Amino acid sequence: SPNSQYLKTRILDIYTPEQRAGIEKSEDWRQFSRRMDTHFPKLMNELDSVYGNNEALLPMLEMLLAQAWQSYSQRNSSLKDIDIARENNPDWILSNKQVGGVCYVDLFAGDLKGLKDKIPYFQELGLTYLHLMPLFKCPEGKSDGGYAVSSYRDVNPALGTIGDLREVIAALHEAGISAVVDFIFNHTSNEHEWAQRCAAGDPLFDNFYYIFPDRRMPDQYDRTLREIFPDQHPGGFSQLEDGRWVWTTFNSFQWDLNYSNPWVFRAMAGEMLFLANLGVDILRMDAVPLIWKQMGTSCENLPQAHALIRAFNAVMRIAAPAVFFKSEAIVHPDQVVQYIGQDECQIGYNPLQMALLWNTLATREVNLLHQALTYRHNLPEHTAWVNYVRSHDDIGWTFADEDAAYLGISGYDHRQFLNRFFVNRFDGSFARGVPFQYNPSTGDCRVSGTAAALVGLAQDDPHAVDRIKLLYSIALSTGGLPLIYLGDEVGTLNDDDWSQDSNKSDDSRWAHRPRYNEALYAQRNDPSTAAGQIYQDLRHMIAVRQSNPRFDGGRLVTFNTNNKHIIGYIRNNALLAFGNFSEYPQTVTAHTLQAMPFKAHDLIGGKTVSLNQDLTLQPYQVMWLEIA
Template identity: 50%
Template sequence: MQTDLAPGFPANPLGIPESTGRRARVALTRLRPVLARHARERIVAGRLDAELWPAFERRLERHFPDLYGHLLALYAGRDDIAHHTERLLLVALDSWLARPAELQRRDADREGTFWYTDHTLVAGVCYVDRFAGDLRGLAERIPYLRQLGIGLLHLMPLFAVPPGQNDGGYAVSDYRQVRPDLGTVDDLRALATALHDAGIALALDFVFNHTASDHRWARELRAAPAGAVDDEDQNPYLMFPDRTVPDAYDGTLREIFPETRSGSFSFDAELGRWVWTTFNSYQWDLDYTNPGVFVRMAGEMLALANMGADVLRLDAVAFTWKRIGTGSESLPQAHDLVRAYNALVRIAAPAMVFLSEAIVHPDEVVSYIDPAECPLSYNPLQMALGWEALATRNTSLLRQSLSHRLALPPGCAWLNYVRSHDDIGWTFDDGDAGLVGINGFDHRAFLNRFYTGRFDGSFARGLPFQENPKTGDARVTGTTASLAGLEKALTEEGPAEVDLAIGRILALYGVAFALPGMPLIYLGDELATRNDHGYRADPDRAGDSRWANRPAMAWDRLPLTQQAGTPEARVNEGLARLTLLRRHPAFAGPATTVLDPGDDAVFAFVRRTGDDAVLVLANWTERPVALPAQVVTAALAVPQVTDLLGGDDWSSDAGTITLAPYQQRWLTTRSIVRD
């Protein structure tokens, strides 16, 4: 929070230095009686626990200065900030008073802790319908999730959406209604309770850059008198009467979905306005320069918290604030926006934390990661460069990039993943690429060709997504198994290629599990699930190749995990072993040193916590590799070690340490793994 002289404040005739901290204290002094009276009335009327107000007041006292400081950074020039701040705190208070008792107990247990940094946590992600049919069906699969070792379950968007196209659920029509085919809000609350009872935290999406064009707010705007579109109290969206301002913006904005349309604005004939639509014409961007929008969305956010969410994934966080002459991504105000919401959550639902979804330049990714902003973040660099190293059979860019981009502030953690519901974008830094002799533009073009099977010798069977003919940019979609070569090996090749494909799958997941952070399994990957090409037969999905990597869970193939030698069994067993061995005490802390093993085929790093250390050696190629013994002895300072993955011992007397194609070794002097 800013504590120096605030330039937006008039000079103080008493000579008292003005700062956001002082203004926050003054504001809270005025607001506290209003809030206390409101709390007493609600507690008496609802026969609630009288201690609810003191608990809220204690956290309000602690976190309001941060909240108010960020609100001032966003809205200091407005004359209605006091009005909106009061409304905001009343929303937070009502949410706290309505918060289920079991979640309030969770708040008390977790407040001030970094529970999400526990190194034994493994995350899973799925679409409810694709995984289990509906919410009740998913509840029945909790034993399966526990068997996999899942400790955090992210459910892809499950709230009401428009009929037809809805961007995979990211066009939300109602944040407080579950899609009817998935169940009800009561079903979601019951699932959250069941997950918590099983020791599994719940992650939900907070889609807060935009709503669906049929959201209640949009419908009310269409039904209102003509002047409502220009009234910020009635119109929460970014709209323009003609192309003058949109054209000024479009000159510096990148196109997110160029296959769908050109530009970032769509004309709504009914309202006679150009609407800001960053992603699709049916997703209307919200206007956060209006503090009333901040208050509206705060209510939706806290409603998700009270449904049982432990983690909120902040969708499209980089796009929330716009300014002419910029790319309107990752502007300073976007950070103030998230930090203000974070402070509000610390007051009204402190058990919940934010997960940043900022798939942007690595420097921008890390800018969102902080306990006061988003303590959890996807690790898109680790994801993209794992695939890059497989394609090139060279780990130099992976090593160069992660050697200085892994460290995070205390109390924060990466979410390491191999693939997602979305696409793969090659978001590495061109400066890092240049240091290892790679031209970034040309290399991205190569990777797109390689993973869409357009490069001779490619093992991948991915699909292109949103190719931009003007820039040559594109992304890639596909399941882990199909991108790693298993689809091609099973349909076009033979057992040797199947072995290599399984090696690639486990190489990617092995590094995701061994690096600092929480590993994430896209559910279905544990069954080596291949692309679902049937999406092309669905008119609402045919134009979106991402549906190829969102296949329905193949429960009929689950018995194959018990048949030795099948791809399903080998991948399933490999992931189970990674989940178990990750409990080794060396992985408890974040300390990681990336090494140069002297052979670019191998990615090497040391994880260390206290006296415990694990040296990870990962062969990223289909050829065997022999490294000199000094690689091990220099890293661990001992002549004899045990390979956690292989179970065998190694001595420096051997002179070299060998790695089979795509083999990983997790070498340590202490093979004890906590149950």
């Protein structure tokens, strides 16, 4: 094994003796060299554990670090300031000041120039964090909504150019907003140069994917593979026109990159460095669990997958310290947290909390949510959750069967009910959702639909607006970076005309992917409209959250309310939150509140609340009570 000093002197060899002396004395090299010393041992250890005595490891690493230096050398000085800032403030992600949003550039604002025009609106809403959906080249028609990448460098012409993208990031940065983009590193589209060249038998792209001669290995692999999109194909493999079979976890036009090849890592680390230099603050690590395969296993959450993401982490610690990771691990809760670490993904989506928010609206019972908040919320130091109500994807019921069993709940049966309820196939259901990927061999099913459609706003349920307010309050107050699915703040309903479009007809997720609703955004300042009610509520909660330090950090302690319909938790021993999930008034008794101060200010309603008597919460009422 080499070391940091060794590789530094080999990196410098591209300069003639005269230049070398000037480079070694410079600021950029000093910082790069210092960071090499601090972080290279982690990088070496992580890559060694995956590749071992692979002949390609040394020369790949020298090539990678040579590019890391070039990349950091070129790096704009504005970004180097954020590098130093975040290097000295690892907990920036954990501040109550952070409130995030997500949107498609096309659907929300037409193009990138239009998105830039929407930046004053984001400031009005209070956003410090904006996730922009896949921006780069993708095949015509079906492309998993941008997640089948055909070019990591060529921006979608319908969205604009790379120059427009740079202007956006710069304008966002001026407005105090972090730019967040997808790092689609598990797979490319079948029309990507790498894909074509690999399949053509170009030796330069040998083993960039997993291509098999026949069904022998596919059949063996399929024994233990989960099916993500059963509607498209069975198992995890698709057949090429020449009869060969390729690894396709998702759609058949999405080919799994082969990380068992150390050159695929270098390739993707090179793409990561490019995104860093555009000024991306947070990379959303798409489909993290799938990047390592092994016969006999589910090819999910494998030790080598975690190792590799930690290798990517070290590359950023060396060449772009500002760049943080957002893990997309939509899996078992035990496996979800294993991606969250300072040396892996600093943050990650919190599907457990999200799925239970919706569960609790359906059952009216807080049990699973309480359990999850009690035992699975707190994280290691310098890490945070991304708490959300809805997203661009379907909802999966990813609670732990083991957890639910402790509460005498059958996981399988409960998911049957949830799916039936949220697609309006249970008596008296307020939800108006659409089935997604019903699998008849596994009984599994997911749910599409917007937040507003799932709470009952489409049929004007009198309780609808209060349900949205309740859900977002919890995402905003539990601890973690809250993410708003833009459009939710005005109660945007489904695109009910999704399925008659043949490019979308087999993908029900398009139902909750509607265009900018001009009518609802026009109503946002009108307190008589649902759009206005929702908007003022969320804006108020965003304001409170950002200005009140009782929300700071990601730690919480649950408070047993002794009412099965009411959630309770405490932040920083100073903010006590209650959330009523029943559509009827519900009471927290004087007996339960004995330890609390006699009176407390409620940041939601603005009133003083007397806690030395019974406390009756209105249907779906939320309280944020300052107790210290």
